[PDB]
Design a protein around this nucleic acid. Structure first.
Lengths: 22, 153, 152, 504, 75, 195
RNA sequence: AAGGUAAGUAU
């Protein structure tokens, strides 16, 4: 809720980088 | 694209008016046999508004071959090359006596079906030599050219 | 309270969906046309065709041997005069607009504009005459009569 | 304003000061108070309202968010059955709470934020906090409070409802929100501050200020399609008024050379068309494009002026091969539709059995003695005179019995000073109908507005309440009713005329 | 002189369409090196212009008078 | 206010990070004849809305190269049959392979594809441009005209509008409802004022 | 604890 951009080191690492791209 | 390219390198008019102690000067009305304006790539700013207006032209004057020609060529410059074929086909269904629409159909349509288009144009207009010679370009077989050209005569 | 989850308005998704609908409608018409466009000896014998043409050459010689107005006019019956006649021209409308092709006379339109201006020129003594909220309804949200067959 | 600043955001403060300048908050409150007065003044003998009064309040009552008072006071004819307090959106009403003789109506304006734009809860809380308060002053123990969220343009109301009030309040508030002068000023100021528009682009556009720059050496075409589809209507005393179609004419006038290209259209073209209005536009655009293709590039136009806004898109479509031609709309109505009223054009085109294309020289021999600028100016003046009267103007056009029109051209042959006199007479004629139909003196017309009258530009202003844009005179505004002496004097007049139709 | 200066410096129709951005219609990025750059209504639907806007030739770029002198001393 | 695209008034920020949108920011309300009705966006019982990450919307280099090789072999075949049939690739045959290869298939249809064929050493020149212009070029390694646009943000912006609750959810945060525009369709900004 | 003072005439 703070709106602060949190680092995704270890966060959202399950998904590949090819997801949601066409 | 060009045949050699590799990985690393419109709204024509069918009305003409010739211009030459009387207040009235009735100038003759002339009709041009064919009119093929250059594609004018990118001359359209509002593609959607132009498409709607050309649709309106097709609705008001279904027997106006320039309307269909401009409407489909607008789809061809846009890159939607499939709807342009449908527009030309409908125009032929509504403007069968105009050889310009049939010549444009033989251009936009894919090869084999293009042949069929010519095979149908003769049904609606057999005297047009221009489409006949066009079929010569459409058929890649000399024997096929023998049939169509001799049928034309 | 419980809010109702409405449809998310995504303009880009709407544009993509419209483009996909156009693409899928184009393919259907292509197949429909191909269902009709794809249903249309001497071709190699030059001598046979030459003989047929020679037969045709002598074959040609052997053969030789108003009730249409039901539209509307944006004027009043009392506007015209029995002792005079006037021309009625089409009112300006956008081509993309689907409104009815109403009919007007330029002089009568000018007179109506003049009378509207003088009425507005005159201040409004009272909005109420002395429905609800007349001035904020009729303006924010033109006598006319159509033509019955030959004429009204 | 009633806008609460949560922190010093100086840019937002400046923007909100500019948006609410000229005491816009007080003016909005006063306008809504007046609107409620009128909507309650009309239905006073149906809601059993004896009278409606605009309570004399402080000029800064719009600003008081801590306390409030009553803006409207309704005095009942007999009594009102007060219902239990409820929101404006509540369909069910328990009309058995109390009874009253006086009803107070309070209008509260607020500028809601994202987290607190709920206007129903706001109205409920304000009503509860103000009714049960020793600081707020009210004239009766029962009433209703209307809350307006200007930032989100929401409206609601909370409190008691006497019978017949809730639907009237709902409809009145809907009408006020949809249309209100002070509200409209707020919307326009917010739009200008945010700087986003509802599709009103600015393009080249023939006004009366760029009229002078029109007169250059470049080729210009005035295209008119007013007289394309036209019928003649005539009322007969013995029978019924009848209409008959007549042939149309497309005008392709060229003010430089005087070439008037007249495309004569037969009535047979409109045989089986349902939509003639756009068929005329497309036919005219096709003819214009064909004529452009006919002329050589040296005589081809590079600026086409259209007298009707409907023929802007069709020309753009039919001039898609000529991008170097600018198509300009004309906001001033040129009198090019009155040239068919000339004796040499009407009968000529009525009896034309086939469509054709004809050329005329509207400048008969003027170009041999005056430039094309003065020729076009006098032609516009003559056409305006013909469009005005066509009866006295035809008399003016020939000043002497010795002035005749040779069959070669249209207008009569006159001397230079004779043309000066004819032009001043026609200018007087053109000013005559403006003096008559507008009931204004001709001498009151300045030299700047006579030019606008000749050209054909006129302005009107139904919404004078937008005067809002420009001891304090803010809350001074008060409601009025016929119940007074002026309303009684207005109701007393015409009462004898209603006595002729009386029922038993 | 003032008219010429105003024509050279005044807003042009294509430069008028340049600073108009359609509301709600997200457009694909045009220039890779600068994502801030955008054509606006230029070439995009919604501008209200059926035909393409033409270049105002009064805004043509040409060399200064003293730079013309150097070209006369070079050829 | 940050990640809303510039067309809707936002800054159009691109996020290479993890930002959560509070659910209280996904609520709006509209007034109709029956009164005021309130709407949310997250019907599914999921977590708070998470803005799309510029992470996921870029194809990796290895997959990009595999796609380039496959697409260019396909184009070589298609051209081979095109020459035999005396026809040219009509932008419809190359529909399945449009934004795939390293020299994007877009470049084959570029209008100025003849003058760029005489442009040699363009990557070295673009790299050396840093010694002539006083601004660093982030795309120093590639040319849009020669190499094509090797990325697309259509899906990213679409999912950014979807995650913020769409136009209705985004515009409840703005003064749009204060302008009393009937709809957002026929609307345009003016980047610079007339004065 | 702040970075949140409208300014201006008049007594």
């Amino acid at each position: 809720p703070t709106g602060e951009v949190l680092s995704l080191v270890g966060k959202l690492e399950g998904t590949r980088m090819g997801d949601k791209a066409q | 694209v060009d045949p050699r390219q590799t990985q690393f390198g419109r709204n024509t008019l069918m009305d003409m008016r010739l211009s030459q102690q009387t207040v009235v000067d009735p100038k003759g009305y002339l009709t041009d046999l064919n009119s093929m304006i250059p594609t004018h790539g990118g001359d359209i700013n509002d593609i959607k508004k132009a498409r709607l207006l050309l649709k309106s032209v097709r609705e008001t004057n279904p027997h106006h071959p320039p309307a269909w020609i401009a409407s489909a060529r607008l789809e061809e410059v846009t890159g939607k090359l499939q709807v342009a074929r449908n527009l030309i086909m409908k125009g032929t269904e509504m403007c069968p006596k105009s050889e310009d629409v049939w010549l444009e159909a033989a251009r936009l349509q894919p090869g084999d079906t293009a042949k069929a288009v010519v095979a149908q144009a003769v049904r609606h207009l057999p005297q047009s030599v221009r489409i006949y010679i066009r079929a010569a370009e459409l058929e890649t077989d000399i024997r096929a050219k023998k049939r169509v050209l001799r049928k034309a005569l | 309270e419980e809010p109702v989850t409405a449809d998310v308005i995504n303009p880009m998704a709407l544009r993509q969906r419209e483009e996909l609908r156009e693409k899928l409608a184009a393919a259907k018409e292509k197949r429909l046309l191909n269902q009709k466009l794809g249903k249309i000896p001497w071709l190699d014998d030059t001598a046979a065709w030459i003989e047929r043409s020679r037969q045709l050459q002598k074959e040609k010689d052997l053969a030789e041997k108003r009730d249409l107005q039901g539209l509307t006019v944006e004027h009043a019956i009392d506007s015209f005069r029995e002792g005079e006649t006037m021309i009625l021209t089409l009112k300006d409308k956008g081509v993309l607009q689907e409104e009815e092709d109403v009919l007007v006379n330029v002089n009568l339109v000018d007179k109506e504009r003049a009378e509207k201006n003088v009425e507005l020129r005159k201040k409004k003594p009272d909005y109420l005459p002395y429905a609800q909220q007349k001035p904020r309804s009729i303006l924010s949200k033109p006598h006319s009569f159509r033509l019955e067959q030959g004429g009204t | 304003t009633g806008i609460f600043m949560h922190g010093k955001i100086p840019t937002l403060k400046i923007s909100l000061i500019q948006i609410f300048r000229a005491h816009l908050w007080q003016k909005i409150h006063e306008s809504i108070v007046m609107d409620l007065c009128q909507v309650f003044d009309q239905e006073l003998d149906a809601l059993e309202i004896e009278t409606v009064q605009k309570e004399t309040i402080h000029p800064r009552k719009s600003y008081k968010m801590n306390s409030s008072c009553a803006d409207i006071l309704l005095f009942a004819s007999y009594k009102w059955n007060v219902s239990r307090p409820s929101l404006l959106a509540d369909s069910k009403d328990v009309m058995d709470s109390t009874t009253t003789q006086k009803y107070w109506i309070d209008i509260q304006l607020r500028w809601g934020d994202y987290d607190s734009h709920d206007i129903e809860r706001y109205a409920r809380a304000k009503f509860l906090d103000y009714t049960t308060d020793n600081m707020s002053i009210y004239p009766s123990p029962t009433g209703v409070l209307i809350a307006i969220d200007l930032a989100y343009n929401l409206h609601s109301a909370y409190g008691n409802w006497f019978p017949g009030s809730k639907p009237l309040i709902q409809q009145a508030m809907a009408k006020i929100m949809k249309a209100n002068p002070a509200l409209y000023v707020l919307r326009e100021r917010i739009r200008k501050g945010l700087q986003l528009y509802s599709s009103e682009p600015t393009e080249p556009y023939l006004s009366s200020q760029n009229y002078g720059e029109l007169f250059s050496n470049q080729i210009i075409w005035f295209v008119d399609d007013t007289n394309v589809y036209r019928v003649t209507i005539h009322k007969t005393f013995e029978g019924n008024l009848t209409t008959k179609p007549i042939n149309g004419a497309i005008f392709i006038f060229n003010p430089r050379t005087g070439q008037l290209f007249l495309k004569i259209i037969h009535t047979s073209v409109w045989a089986g068309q349902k939509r003639l209005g756009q068929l005329a536009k497309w036919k005219t655009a096709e003819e214009v494009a064909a004529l452009i293709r006919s002329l050589p590039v040296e005589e081809q136009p590079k600026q086409i002026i259209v007298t009707r806004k409907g023929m802007l898109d069709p020309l753009e479509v039919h001039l898609l091969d000529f991008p170097n031609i600018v198509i300009k709309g004309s906001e001033l109505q040129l009198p090019f539709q009155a040239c068919l009223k000339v004796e040499k054009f009407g009968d000529l085109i009525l009896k034309a059995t086939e469509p054709q294309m004809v050329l005329f020289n509207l400048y008969d021999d003027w170009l041999k003695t005056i430039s094309s600028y003065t020729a076009f100016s006098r032609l516009i003046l003559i056409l305006r005179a013909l469009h005005v009267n066509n009866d006295r103007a035809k008399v003016i056009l020939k000043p002497d019995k010795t002035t005749i029109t040779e069959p070669h051209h249209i207008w009569p042959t006159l001397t230079d000073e004779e043309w000066i006199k004819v032009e001043v007479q026609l200018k007087d004629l053109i000013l005559a109908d403006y003096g008559k139909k507008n009931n204004v003196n001709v001498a009151s017309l300045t030299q700047s507005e006579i030019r606008d009258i000749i050209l054909g530009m006129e302005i009107s202003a139904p919404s004078q309440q937008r005067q809002q844009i420009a001891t304090s005179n803010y809350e001074t505004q008060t409601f009025s009713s016929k119940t007074e002496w002026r309303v009684r004097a207005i109701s007393a007049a015409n009462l004898h005329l209603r006595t002729n139709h009386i029922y038993v | 002189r003032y008219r010429k200066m105003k024509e050279r410096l005044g807003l042009t129709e294509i430069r008028k369409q340049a600073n108009r951005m359609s509301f709600g219609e997200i457009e694909e990025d045009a220039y890779q090196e600068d994502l801030g750059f955008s054509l606006g209504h230029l070439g995009k639907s919604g501008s209200g212009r059926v035909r393409q806007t033409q270049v105002n030739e009064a805004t043509k770029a040409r060399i200064s008078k003293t730079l013309q002198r150097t070209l006369q001393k070079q050829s | 206010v940050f990640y809303t695209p510039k067309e809707l008034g936002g800054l159009g920020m691109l996020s290479m990070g993890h930002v959560l949108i509070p659910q209280s920011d996904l609520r709006w309300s509209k007034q109709t004849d029956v009164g005021i009705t309130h709407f949310r966006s997250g019907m599914s019982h999921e977590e708070d809305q998470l803005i799309p990450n510029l992470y996921r919307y870029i194809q990796p280099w290895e997959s990009e190269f595999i796609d380039s090789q496959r697409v260019w072999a396909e184009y070589a075949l298609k051209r081979q049959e095109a020459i035999a049939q005396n026809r040219r690739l009509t932008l419809e045959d190359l529909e399945d392979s449009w934004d795939r290869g390293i020299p994007r298939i877009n470049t084959l249809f570029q209008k100025d594809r003849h003058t760029l064929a005489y442009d040699k050493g363009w990557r070295v020149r673009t790299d050396f441009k840093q010694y002539q212009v006083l601004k660093q070029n982030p795309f120093w390694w590639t040319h849009q005209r020669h190499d094509g646009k090797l990325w697309n943000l259509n899906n990213y912006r679409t999912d950014m509008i979807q995650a913020l609750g769409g136009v209705e959810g985004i515009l409840e945060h703005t003064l749009f409802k204060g302008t009393y525009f009937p709809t957002w369709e026929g609307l345009f900004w003016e980047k610079a004022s007339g004065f």
